[PDB]
Amino acid sequence: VNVNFRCDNGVTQMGDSVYAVGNVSQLGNWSPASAVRLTDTSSYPTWKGSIALPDGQNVEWKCLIRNEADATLVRQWQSGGNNQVQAAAGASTSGSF
């Protein structure tokens, strides 16, 4: 199913983007290099994306500012508790820096 992800206050420098990283394979199993880049900056500094996830799966994730070119180079992890979503049609989940 397609789940909407949103990260607020993603103030990045050119060359760094906001990614969703989290505790399932589709979100990289917490690995920055396999995080999913958020594609929509039409309401900057909010970053948004649509991410396919298995229906009904409970997922924990964080917003991540990461370098685009060096996939291991993290600039900032969202602080605090993980964002939580149960994947379902029309589901939406958000975090904030």
Q: Copy the structure tokens of residue 19.
A: 């990614």
Specified resolution (Å): 1.5
Q: Copy the structure tokens of residue 49.
A: 């994306």
Name residues whose C-beta falls within 8 Å of residue 74's C-beta, 6 or more positions apart in sequence: 32, 64, 65, 66, 67
Task: Please report, for residues 15, 70, 77, the alpha-carbon distance to residue 4 in angstroms, rounded to integers and kept in the order given.
Answer: 24, 26, 19
d(CA 44, CA 29): 27
d(CA 63, CA 69): 18
d(CA 33, CA 46): 21
Decide the pairing of beta strands 36-37 and 92-96.
Answer: unpaired
d(CA 17, CA 61): 16
- Residue 72 gets the label, from left (phi > 0), alpha (psi -120 to 50) or beta, of alpha
Cis peptide before 54 (omega within 30 of 0): no
Bridge partners, residue 58, by sequence: 86
- List the chain domain ranges: 1-97
Q: For residue 42, which phi and psi values (nearest 5 degrees)?
A: -70, -10
Return the biggest CA–CA distance within the chain. 36
SS3 per-residue string spanning 8-64: ECCCCCCCEEEEEEECCHHHHHHCHHHCEECCEEEECCEEEEEEECCCCCEEEEEEE
